[PDB]
Design a protein around this motif. Sequence first.
Motif, PDB file in Angstrom:
ATOM      1  N   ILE A  35      -7.495  -0.992   2.122  1.00 44.18           N
ATOM      2  CA  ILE A  35      -6.317  -1.856   2.058  1.00 44.18           C
ATOM      3  C   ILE A  35      -6.465  -3.152   2.855  1.00 44.18           C
ATOM      4  O   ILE A  35      -5.792  -4.139   2.551  1.00 44.18           O
ATOM      5  N   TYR A  57      -8.560  -5.601   0.564  1.00 46.92           N
ATOM      6  CA  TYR A  57      -8.332  -5.399  -0.860  1.00 46.92           C
ATOM      7  C   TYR A  57      -8.357  -6.727  -1.602  1.00 46.92           C
ATOM      8  O   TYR A  57      -7.862  -7.745  -1.115  1.00 46.92           O
ATOM      9  N   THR A 116      -1.860  -1.370  -4.027  1.00 47.25           N
ATOM     10  CA  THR A 116      -3.117  -0.634  -3.939  1.00 47.25           C
ATOM     11  C   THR A 116      -2.908   0.808  -4.396  1.00 47.25           C
ATOM     12  O   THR A 116      -1.806   1.355  -4.309  1.00 47.25           O
ATOM     13  N   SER A 135      -4.250   5.429   3.554  1.00 50.90           N
ATOM     14  CA  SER A 135      -3.825   5.711   2.192  1.00 50.90           C
ATOM     15  C   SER A 135      -3.371   7.159   2.081  1.00 50.90           C
ATOM     16  O   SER A 135      -3.881   8.052   2.772  1.00 50.90           O
ATOM     17  N   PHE A 179       0.832  -1.199   0.000  1.00 52.07           N
ATOM     18  CA  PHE A 179       0.000   0.000   0.000  1.00 52.07           C
ATOM     19  C   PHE A 179       0.869   1.252   0.000  1.00 52.07           C
ATOM     20  O   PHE A 179       2.111   1.189  -0.011  1.00 52.07           O
TER      21      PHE A 179
END
Length: 271
Positions: A37, A40, A31, A245, A10
């Motif tokens: 995440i 995912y 990702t 993220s 990620f």
Amino acid sequence: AKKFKVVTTFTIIQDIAQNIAGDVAVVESITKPGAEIHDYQPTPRDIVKAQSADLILWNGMNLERWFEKFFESIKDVPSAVVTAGITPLPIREGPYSGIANPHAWMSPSNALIYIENIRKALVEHDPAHAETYNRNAQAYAEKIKALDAPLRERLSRIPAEQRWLVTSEGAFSYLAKDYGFKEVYLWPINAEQQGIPQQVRHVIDIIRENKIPVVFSESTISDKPAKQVSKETGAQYGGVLYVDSLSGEKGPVPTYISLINMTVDTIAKGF
Ligand SMILES: [Fe+3]
């Protein structure tokens, strides 16, 4: 030439690793910015991407519930767990009670350990550039260390008994411990799960008892539950925090440092 290639699960790890790599290696994330995440669902394109790497980095602490199954399709690519040596905080309630809370990167002192594990893996598997990795890693660690004073100062207007951090995912436990916040969340860790409707009720009680002014959501999940909590309590909806993220490169949170800073800034603004 064809640079050493690193693939991370990620985006947070991607950005930390790219700072250590400099222009000597290329680091890519499986990702995409904004994507959830924990659960995912990898695709065939992702297999090819990971298979093209010279080194694969992942969080561990069972963050990526998908990774171990996915990695079984990858051959002859070394991997390294970037939370090695971090002491986990356990998940405190719900169906994952007692499992490690995987969000260790939200403590900047833990990020120093991330940095060291990534440096070690880079030096081991790309020894031709060890001097660049070592130089870059020490320089980046110093930038992370320099965040502590402005971060604490940014939050210093909030008196102790008022330092309540109400979020959606309980993803902020390591940051909350670092800066003396008590945590309240609508669910303990991202997952398909029950109990969120009734936990929304409990959080409504805690806010009223403690006169908590603000509640937040996060960038990879729905803002609706936190917005509902704000409407049924005397609390403001303080906006979107970043944890799982980064944003896009042109977005507000392109880097790990910007993620820590903006999240703390947004909390501070909410009070
Ligand atoms: Fe999360």
